[PDB]
Design a protein around this ligand. Structure first.
Ligand SMILES: *[C@@H]1O[C@H](CO)[C@@H](O)[C@H](O)[C@H]1NC(C)=O
Ligand SMILES: [Ca+2]
Length: 441
């Protein structure tokens, strides 16, 4: 069977769309009018109220604040959680704080709020409509798709994939936690993949297996650059879903079943913040999140670390990094080596960096027997880049009738984005819970 819609062509239920083991059900995409796709344009001139654009009517572009001399960024959603309807606009608003741009929100909510197989297939049509908007801009306004980025969250990532597939030379597609079900294992035609655009960057935030962890995202690398903040499966500050061998995808997408969307939505929360923090998400290539957490993949490679999020395009396999558990998710990773002094004691040795741009909190470096003349290292993610490190503060908390004094004769510090190391020293020691300051050496 095949359905054909005006100007966007036809869609069949032939393989790989259906009739396969990965996509068993033969379901065709709803019509453009049932889906009700809307292209809402926001620009710095009109940051609060939209102007409606129609891909079949060039005049809407003339009757809008659209600028042919600016970049364009489409925001295409997927799963909408209660209270989350304004996220796309919230994201455009952050773009306006750093650039003059045409921000088009693509709302196709009616087409997404139905059974999963139907929502998955409706993606085909929405992506064809986005490609339609792009062919029209190209045709009637000589505006090249190289000047466009498609940001697709969840099912929207595959909507972007489709658009790219249909629009040769699209500059960029950012996938924010692309859904896995009905897309993994299919020909590149069905899913977002590197061939959909000149640069495809992907953020994974809910990649644990659907069964039984109810993870909506994918573990599979899908772009030129793939980022797995906090490992990509569980995000700090997010509650998780109760396990189950039986998941009701249809019920969750039609909005009748409970679902903890926190992990799935983090992808766009981090992207939105990255727009405002150009250095807050340095990412490190690593074999696994465990190797990263075991201090095996730091500092940044010679050429630098790519930023996860908005500025990932500045960069010329798997990338890891950590974020905060709440807003200003931005973090900067540092490495430190403490050579102990004073007397033997058992406890938790800590360090805080004080630089030109500010200082960090105290971070746990090593816990155990603190023996003079020994050296221990660790890496931690702080809340800011301290700039030039001017001094470091050592502190230890004990776990002794002689009131031992523990110190650090030397602390070396390594900023993730620098090639050199910085040395700080002291000949002093302090008692538990007393701050010792080390100076340059
Ligand atoms: C847009 O370009 C197409 C293809 O060249 C043309 O058929 C159509 O009439 C143009 N639209 C308008 C409003 O001129
Ligand atoms: Ca594709």
């Amino acid at each position: 069977k095949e359905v054909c819609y005006e100007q966007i062509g036809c869609f069949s239920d032939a393989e790989p769309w259906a009739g396969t083991a990965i996509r068993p059900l033969k379901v065709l995409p709803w019509s453009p009018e049932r889906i009700g796709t809307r292209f809402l344009l926001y620009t710095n001139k009109n940051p609060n109220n939209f102007q409606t654009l129609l891909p079949s009517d060039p005049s809407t572009i003339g009757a809008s604040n659209f600028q042919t001399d600016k970049k364009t960024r489409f925001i295409i959603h997927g799963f909408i959680d209660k209270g989350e309807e304004n996220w796309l606009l919230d994201m455009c608003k952050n773009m306006f704080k750093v650039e003059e741009v045409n921000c088009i929100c693509v709302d196709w909510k009616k087409g997404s709020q139905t059974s999963y197989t139907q929502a998955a297939n409706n993606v085909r049509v929405v992506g064809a409509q986005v490609a339609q908007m792009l062919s029209m801009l190209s045709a009637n306004y000589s505006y090249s798709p190289s000047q466009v980025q498609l940001i697709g969250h969840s099912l929207g990532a595959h909507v972007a994939g489709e658009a790219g597939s249909r629009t040769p030379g699209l500059g960029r597609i950012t996938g924010l936690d692309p859904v896995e079900a009905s897309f993994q294992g299919t020909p590149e035609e069905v899913r977002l993949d590197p061939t959909d655009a000149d640069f495809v960057d992907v953020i994974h935030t809910d990649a644990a297996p659907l069964i039984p962890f109810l993870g909506f995202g994918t573990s599979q690398q899908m772009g030129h650059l793939d980022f797995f903040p906090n490992g990509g499966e569980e995000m700090p500050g997010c509650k998780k879903n109760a396990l189950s061998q039986i998941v009701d995808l249809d019920g969750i997408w039609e909005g009748t079943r409970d679902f903890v969307a926190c992990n799935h939505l983090r992808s766009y929360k981090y992207y939105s913040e990255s727009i405002l923090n150009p250095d807050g998400f340095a990412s490190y290539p690593c074999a696994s999140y465990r190797a990263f957490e075991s201090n095996k993949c730091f500092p940044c490679p010679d050429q630098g670390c790519p930023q996860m999020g908005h500025y990932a395009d500045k960069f010329a396999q798997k990338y890891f990094l950590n974020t905060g558990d709440s807003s200003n998710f931005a973090r900067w990773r540092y490495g430190v080596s403490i050579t102990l002094s004073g007397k033997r004691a058992t406890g938790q040795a800590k360090v805080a960096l004080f630089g030109s741009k500010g200082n960090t909190h105290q971070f746990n470096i090593f816990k155990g027997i603190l023996k003079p003349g020994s050296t221990h290292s660790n890496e931690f993610d702080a809340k800011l880049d301290v700039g030039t490190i001017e001094k470091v503060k050592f502190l230890w908390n004990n776990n002794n009738p002689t009131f031992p004094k523990v110190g650090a004769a030397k602390i070396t510090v390594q900023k993730g984005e620098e090639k050199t190391v910085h040395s700080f020293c002291s000949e002093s020691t302090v008692r538990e819970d007393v701050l010792l300051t080390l100076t340059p050496c």
